[PDB]
RNA sequence: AUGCCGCGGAGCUAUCAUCUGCCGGAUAACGGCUGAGCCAGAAUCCGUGCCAGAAAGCGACGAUU
């Protein structure tokens, strides 16, 4: 169509400035420095009120308005509350052993499945990790915190065995807000 | 036409002797993340490394009858 526009309201956040459609949004928590340079829209911040827009755009381009309205406040959520993951570790035999170092920026997995290898994972920049069984993933950035949280996932991963009786893993429990 | 036999240094030489022979990045299959853009990801691929050095690619330097 010529004209699909979505609306959203902001919130008593500092900046959303989008400078080469660059949203440098900082708000009470921190700072989302994110592009929207995949989408061809014209967003214009009016007052409190920013309209995503799309001219002569067709289903395929129109299709992202809606993402692009979902991502931006994403990260409005991020910058106003934070997301925090709580993911809760399952063994049958072997307890899986887990260290944080330099404030959990660094996670080390040990005795996963009997395994004597020690699997290191470096989380994406936003993102720290604490003990709560228990591992709480809270950042600004959900795209960190989800990848962070998939990357432990992955790398606890059982291999060449029956799923059907080995239920070892790292499965998310619970996406919230601070 | 080195007569033969034993041992024979030196040199040559032997998977007949000894020594030496890695970690980065980007990916496929494939699985995720959010919902395209990223992530994880192979003996694959490109580089690090190793060989040659363009005899019409080049630099710094020395002395200049």
Known sequence: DIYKDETLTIPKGVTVDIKARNVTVTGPRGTLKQNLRHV?????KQGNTIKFIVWHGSRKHNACIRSVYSIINNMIIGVTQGFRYKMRLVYAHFPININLTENGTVVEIRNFLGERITRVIKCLPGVTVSISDEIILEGNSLENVSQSAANIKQICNVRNKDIRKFLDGIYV??????
Do not use: F
């Open 173 to 178: 429990s619970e996406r919230g807000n601070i």
């Open 40 to 44: 061809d829209i014209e967003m214009k």
